[PDB]
Amino acid sequence: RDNIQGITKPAIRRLARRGGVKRISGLIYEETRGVLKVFLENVIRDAVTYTEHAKRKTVTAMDVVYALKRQGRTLYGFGG
Amino acid sequence: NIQGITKPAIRRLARRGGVKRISGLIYEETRGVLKVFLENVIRDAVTYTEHAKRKTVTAMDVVYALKRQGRTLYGFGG
Amino acid sequence: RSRKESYSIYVYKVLKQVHPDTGISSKAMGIMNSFVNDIFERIAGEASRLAHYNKRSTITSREIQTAVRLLLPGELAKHAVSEGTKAVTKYTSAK
Amino acid sequence: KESYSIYVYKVLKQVHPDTGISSKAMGIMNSFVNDIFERIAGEASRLAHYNKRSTITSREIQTAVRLLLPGELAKHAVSEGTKAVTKYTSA
Amino acid sequence: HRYRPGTVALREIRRYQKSTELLIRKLPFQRLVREIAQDFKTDLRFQSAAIGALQEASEAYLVGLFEDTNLCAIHAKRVTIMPKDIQLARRIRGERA
Amino acid sequence: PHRYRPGTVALREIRRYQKSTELLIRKLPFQRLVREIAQDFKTDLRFQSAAIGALQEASEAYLVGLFEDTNLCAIHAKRVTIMPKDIQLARRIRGER
Amino acid sequence: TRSSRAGLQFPVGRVHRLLRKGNYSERVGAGAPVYLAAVLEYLTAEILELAGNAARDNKKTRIIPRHLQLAIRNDEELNKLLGRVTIAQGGVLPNIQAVLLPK
Amino acid sequence: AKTRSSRAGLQFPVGRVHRLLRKGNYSERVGAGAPVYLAAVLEYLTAEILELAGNAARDNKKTRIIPRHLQLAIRNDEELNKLLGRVTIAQGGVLPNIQAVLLPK
DNA sequence: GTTTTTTTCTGTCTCGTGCCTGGTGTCTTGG
DNA sequence: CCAAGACACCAGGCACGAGACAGAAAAAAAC
DNA sequence: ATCAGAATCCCGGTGCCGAGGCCGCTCAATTGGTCGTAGACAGCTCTAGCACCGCTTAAACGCACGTACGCGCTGTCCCCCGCGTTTTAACCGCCAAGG
C-alpha cells in the first residue's frame, strides 16, 4: 500500500536533470507516477505469465529479460 | 523527378490527416522525408529480389520488407 | 496448375454463422486471410521462444494457452482461452 | 554454459592490445552478440520459408546481412565474409 | 462573392475522411518510384500490384505522420504547421539521429 | 550572503548527473512498489535481485526518454516550464497509449 | 475430420501440417492445433462480429474494408493489438480537433 | 590444421554455430559455408565496435571498458546508433545534451 | 565548483592447471 | 555430391585460485 | 436573429459485374498399425529468498521568501485561401504526305 506515494519529488528532480530538464512544474509528479505504474503493470504481468508457464514460483532475471524483449523495449546487460 | 509531387497532393494528405492551415517549406520537407522512406523500403525490397535471382520485384517481397521495417500491411497477400 | 491456399471458405462459414444476412468483398476476405496469417505467425514465434526458454521441443495446448495470454490483451484473451478450453474438453472427451 | 570471453580477449588484443575490460562490459557484449546472432538467424529462416529452400547456404547469410545492417557496415561485412570463404575454401 | 477562410478546408476534411481511395495518382508516383529504383541495379521490372502496395503504405504513413505533426502544432499554441514541427515529431519517433 | 539568483544550480547538477553512471531511484521503496504491483495477478511470488535491478534500469531509461522528448516539446513551446500535456503528446506520438 | 470431431470450423490437419513445415519444434502434440484453431475461430468471430455491426451502421450488405478499419479503430483492446497494422483502403478515424473548429 | 577455426584463421568456434543452427529449429539442413560466413560476420562486428570502444575508453585514461564507454561509442556512431535504436544498455545513461537556451549568456 | 595530483587500500583479472566434452576424420547414401 | 550420422580419436574450455595490478577515493590544492 | 443562396444529403434508377452458388475432380486428412524416448513424475540437496533488527547518516519535508518565466493582453503586419485565370499532363484518332 501507498508505495506509489513512495516516489519522491527529489527523485523525479534527479531524473529530470539527467533527463536534462531544467524547469519543473508542480502538476507533473502524480502523472509521472501513473505512467510509471502502467508501464510496470504490463511488464510484471508478462514476466509473471512467463513464470506461470515456468512452473516455478520464483521469477528470474532471464524471465524479465525475455518479457521485455517481447515488448520491444529490449534491454541488454544481464543475459538472455 | 522528386518534383512530380504536386502541392495539392500534400494538401490532400493534410486533409485526410485532417490538418487545416499550411505553411511554405512544408512541401520540400515532405518530399525529402518521403524520399528517405522509399529509399530504405525499396533498397531492402531489391535486396529480397537479389536473393530471388529474378528480374522483377515481387509484391510478396515488398510486403516482407514492410514486415522487416515493422510496417505490417495486410490486403495484398502477406 | 499449382494449387494455391486460402482460408476463405472457413471464415466464410463462420461469417455465415454469426451473420446469415451479410455479404462480403473478395479483397476483405484476403485481408482476413492475411490476418489469420499474422496472428498465427506471432503465436508460433512465441511458441518457439517458449520452447527455447523451456529447453523442450514438444508442443502441447498449454503452451498455446500461455502464448495467447502473452500476446493478446486480457479480457479478449480470457474469453478466447475459455473457448479453446471448452473445445479441448469437447474434443478430447470423445475421440 | 559458455560465454565468449577469451574470444573477446583475442579480438581486443588484435585491435587495442593494451586494454582491460570489466565483467559486466563482457556481459553486455555477449548479450549483444546473442541478439545479433538470433536476429540474423531468424531472418535467414524467414528467407528459407519465404523462398521454399529447404536449407541455407552462405548466399542467404549475405543477403540477410544486407537486410539488417546499413551500407558501409554491410559492404565491409560482405567483404570480410567472402575473404573468409576464400581462405577456408583454399584449404 | 467571397467566402471566409478556413471553412472550405474543414468541409473537405469531412469529405476526405470518407473515401479511402488513393490520393496521389498513378503515373507520376510510378515514375518517382522507378527513378529511385534505377540506382541499385539497372532496369528492374515491376508488378503493378506491388506498385499499389507501395502507394497505399506511403500514403497512410504520411497521413499518420501528419496527424502527429498537427497535434504537435495544436500543442504549440498555433494552428498552422511548421517544418520544425515535422522535425519534432520525427525526433520523437527516431528516424533521424 | 551568496544567495545566487538562479541558473548555475540546475545546469550544474545536470552536468553532474550526466558525468554520473549509476541509478537515481533508491532501492527499497521501488522494490516494495514492485511487490505491491506483483501481489495482484498471482500471489506470493519470489524474486532474485538482478531481475529487480533490470526493472529499475529499464524504468529509469524509459522515463529518461520521456523527459528528453518532453524537453524538446517544451523547447518548441517557447518555454522552459514543462506541462503535463507535453508528456501526453509525447506518449501520443510514441503509440504507447 | 477432427474439426467436426472437435465440433469446430477450422481444419486441424492443415494447421498440423503447417506447424511441421514451419520448423516450429521437433515434435508436435495431439490437440495443440485444436486449441490454436479455436483461438483463431473466436478471434475472427469477434472481429467480424464488430464488422457486421459496422455494416449495420452504414446499412451496407457487402463488407467493405473501411468497415474493417473502423471496427479496428473503435474497440480498445483490438486497436492496441493491431497498433502497428495498416490496411489498404483503410482510412482513419473521422476526427476533428475542435480547437480548430471556428467560433 | 585439424580444427576448422584454424582452417578459417578466425577466432570463433564454427561447429558451435552449426550445432546452434541444428539445435535451433532453424532449417532442416545446414550447409558448410553458411556457419563460417556468419561467424566471420560476427567477428567483423566485434572488431568494428570494439574499435570505437577502444577509442572511447582511451578518452578517459582508463584501461578498462565501462558500459558508459560502450553507450558513448554507440551514440557517437551513426550506423550503430540506427542499428541499436530500440536498444538500451545497462548502466548506460545518454549523451550530454545541453541545449543552447540553457547556458548563462 | 572545477579539477588535478599524492598515497592507499583494494577489488578483479590474468595467469595456471585439470578435468571433459564437445570437436574432428570419413565412409554411404540420399535427397 | 557432399551433409547426416555413426563411430572412433582427441586436445582444448572452463571452473577455481593467486598474486598482482589497474584503480576509486582521501585530501591537498590551484583557477 | 434572418434571408439568399451555395453545399451537401438523400431518393429512385439502371446497369453491370463480380460474389456467390455450383459442380466435377484428387490429393492430403484420415485410419490403422508399429517403435521409442521425452517427459511426467518421484524424489535429493543446498541456496537463497525472506524476515528482522541495530546502528549511521544522508536524504527528504516544511517553510521563508523573493522573483521571474507563463501568461493574458495588445498591436501589428504579412502572407496563405481562395477563387479566378489559364495551362500542360497525358491518352487519342483525323490528315496529310509519300511513296
CA distance E76 to F76: 7
Chain D residues within 8 A of H82 when measuring between CB atoms: 70
Question: How is chain F split into domains, by residue range?
Answer: 2-97
| End-to-end CA separation in angstroms for chain D | 31
Q: Which of residues 55-94 of H touch strand I (CB under 7 A)?
A: 64
**Which stretches of chain A are DSSP H helices?**
9-18, 29-54, 61-71
Q: φ and ψ at H91, to 5 degrees? A: 55, 40
What 8-state DSSP symbol labels residue H88?
B
> Which residues, including other chains, have CB under 8 Å from residue F6's CB and lie 6 or more apart?
none
Q: b/e for C63-72, b at 16 or more Cβ within 10 A?
A: bbbbbbbbbb
Is C70–A70 a contact, with Cβ atoms under 8 angstroms apart?
Answer: yes
Chain E residues within 8 A of G100 when measuring between CB atoms: 10, 74, 79
Distance (Å) from the alpha carbon of E55 to chain G's nearest alpha carbon: 9
Q: Strands E45-46, B56-57: parallel, antiparallel or unpaired by DSSP?
A: parallel
Chain F residues within 8 A of E89 when measuring between CB atoms: 93
Q: Provide the positions of strand J that have an atom within 7 A of a protein CB.
A: 2-5, 13-15, 22-24
Cell of F85: 500535456
Domain extent at residue H15: 3-105
Is E17–G66 a contact, with Cβ atoms under 8 angstroms apart?
Answer: no
Is A76–H99 a contact, with Cβ atoms under 8 angstroms apart?
Answer: no
Q: Would the Cβ of H19 be found within 7 angstroms of any atom in strand I? A: yes
Is F71–H99 a contact, with Cβ atoms under 8 angstroms apart?
Answer: yes
> Which residues, including other chains, have CB under 8 Å from residue E76's CB and lie 6 or more apart?
E82, E85, F76, F77
DSSP chain G: -HHHHTT-SS-HHHHHHHHHTTT--S---SSHHHHHHHHHHHHHHHHHHHHHHHHHHHT-SEEPHHHHHHHHHHSHHHHHHTTT-B-TT--------GGGS--
Candidates C57, C87, C92; nearest CB to G8: C87
Q: Which residues pair with F47 in a beta bridge?
A: A59
> Which residues, including other chains, have CB under 8 Å from residue F74's CB and lie 6 or more apart?
A21, A23, F80, F81, F82, F83, F86
Count how many Cα atoms sit within 13 Å of the Cα of residue H41 in the half-sphere of its side chain.
29
From residue G103, give the alpha-carbon distance in Å to each of E6, E76, E91. Answer: 11, 19, 33
Nearest alpha-carbon partner for A80 in A63, A59, A58: A63
Query: Helices G12-20 and G32-58 sit at what angle, rounded to 10 degrees?
Result: 120
CA distance A56 to A53: 8
Q: Which residue has the cell 518510384?
A: E33
Residues of chain H whose C-beta is under 8 A from some C-beta in A?
A: 67, 86-91, 93-94, 97-99, 102
> Which residues, including other chains, have CB under 8 Å from residue G31's CB and lie 6 or more apart?
C60, C61, C88, C91, C92
Cell of H83: 542499428
Residue B8 C-alpha from the chain's centroid: 18
From residue D73, give the alpha-carbon distance in Å to each of B12, B37, D16, D76, H37. Answer: 39, 20, 20, 5, 15
From residue H47, give the alpha-carbon distance in Å to each of B7, H44, H51, H83. Answer: 48, 5, 6, 16
- Which helix or strand (DSSP H or E) is residue D17 part of? none
Q: Would the Cβ of H65 be found within 7 angstroms of any atom in strand J? A: no
Domains identified in chain A and CATH numbers: 1-80 (1.10.20.10)
For H74, name the nearest residue in chain E, comparing CA atoms only.
E97
Cell of D55: 536449407
If you compute the radius of gyration of chain A from its CA atoms, what whole number of angstroms results?
16
Q: Are F92 and E71 in contact (CB under 8 A)?
A: yes
Is E88–F77 a contact, with Cβ atoms under 8 angstroms apart?
Answer: no
Distance (Å) from the alpha carbon of G79 to chain D's nearest alpha carbon: 27
Resolution of the PDB structure in angstroms: 6.9
Tally of helices (H runs) and strands (E runs) in chain H: 5, 2
Q: φ and ψ at F46, to 5 degrees? A: -110, 160
Which residue of B68, B74, B76 to mutate against C (max C Cβ within 10 Å)? B74
Burial of F33: CB neighbours in 10 Å, binned 0-12, 13-18, 19+: buried
Chain C residues within 8 A of B72 when measuring between CB atoms: 38
Biggest CA pair distance of chain C: 49
CA distance C88 to D85: 52
CA distance H41 to D84: 9
DSSP C24-39: E-HHHHHHHHHHHHHH
B25 — contact with chain E (CB < 8 Å)?
Answer: yes
CA distance F29 to G13: 53
Q: Strands H64-65, D55-56: parallel, antiparallel or unpaired by DSSP?
A: unpaired
Q: Which residue has the cell 479478449?
A: C76
- Which helix or strand (DSSP H or E) is residue H64 part of? strand H64-65
Q: How many domains does chain H fold into? A: 1
Q: Which residue has the cell 455494416?
A: G55
Distance (Å) from the alpha carbon of F69 to chain H's nearest alpha carbon: 12
Q: SS3 breakdown of chain D: % helix, strand, coil, rounded to 5?
A: 80, 5, 20
CA distance A3 to A51: 24
Count how many Cα atoms sit within 13 Å of the Cα of residue G88 in the half-sphere of its side chain.
24
Q: φ and ψ at E23, to 5 degrees? A: -75, -55
With contact defined as 3+ CB pairs under 8 Å, the chains touching C are A, B, G, H
Q: Which residue has the cell 444476412?
A: C21
Strands (DSSP E) contained in D1-91 are 20-21, 55-56
Nearest alpha-carbon partner for A49 in A68, A73, A72: A68
C1-95 under CATH 1.10.540.10, yes or no: no
Query: For residues D79, D81, D85 and D87, what is the CA-based torsion angle, rounded to 10 degrees?
Result: 70
> Which residues, including other chains, have CB under 8 Å from residue D65's CB and lie 6 or more apart?
D40, D74, D77, D78, D81, H41
Q: From 3.30.70.360, 1.10.10.10, 1.10.20.10, 1.10.390.10, which CATH number describes the F2-97 domain?
A: 1.10.20.10
| Touch of C by E (3+ CB pairs closer than 8 Å) | no
Nearest nt by C1' to F80 Cα: K69
H100 — contact with chain F (CB < 8 Å)?
Answer: no
CA distance C95 to F75: 68
Distance (Å) from the alpha carbon of C13 to chain A's nearest alpha carbon: 34
Nearest alpha-carbon partner for F89 in G102, B14, E85: E85
Taking the CA atoms of C78, C83, C85 and C86 in sequence, report the sign of the dihedral they define.
positive
Count how many Cα atoms sit within 13 Å of the Cα of residue A23 in the half-sphere of its side chain.
15
E1-97 under CATH 1.10.20.10, yes or no: yes
The CATH number assigned to the domain with range D1-91 reads: 1.10.20.10
From residue G71, give the alpha-carbon distance in Å to each of B57, C16, E96. Answer: 33, 19, 33
Chain D residues within 8 A of H66 when measuring between CB atoms: 22, 25
Q: Would the Cβ of C24 be found within 7 angstroms of any atom in strand K? A: yes
- Which helix or strand (DSSP H or E) is residue H76 part of? none
Q: Are D20 and H60 in contact (CB under 8 A)?
A: no
Nearest alpha-carbon partner for F46 in A67, A59, A52: A59
Q: Which residues pair with B56 in a beta bridge?
A: E45
Question: How is chain D split into domains, by residue range?
Answer: 1-91
- Return residues 17-76 of F near A (CB < 8 Å): 17-18, 20, 24-26, 29-30, 32-34, 36-38, 41-42, 44-48, 50-51, 53-55, 57-64, 66-68, 70-71, 74
Residue type, B62: V
B63 — contact with chain D (CB < 8 Å)?
Answer: no
D45 — contact with chain G (CB < 8 Å)?
Answer: yes
From residue B9, give the alpha-carbon distance in Å to each of B18, E37, G93. Answer: 14, 22, 20
For H67, name the nearest residue in chain A, comparing CA atoms only.
A77
From residue F33, give the alpha-carbon distance in Å to each of E7, E8, F37, F47. Answer: 52, 53, 6, 14
Residue type, D31: S
Q: Which residue has the cell 479441448?
A: C88
Q: Are H21 and G23 in contact (CB under 8 A)?
A: no
Biggest CA pair distance of chain G: 67
Q: Which residue has the cell 519465404?
A: D50
From residue H19, give the alpha-carbon distance in Å to each of A77, C18, H31, H32, H36. Answer: 25, 49, 12, 12, 12
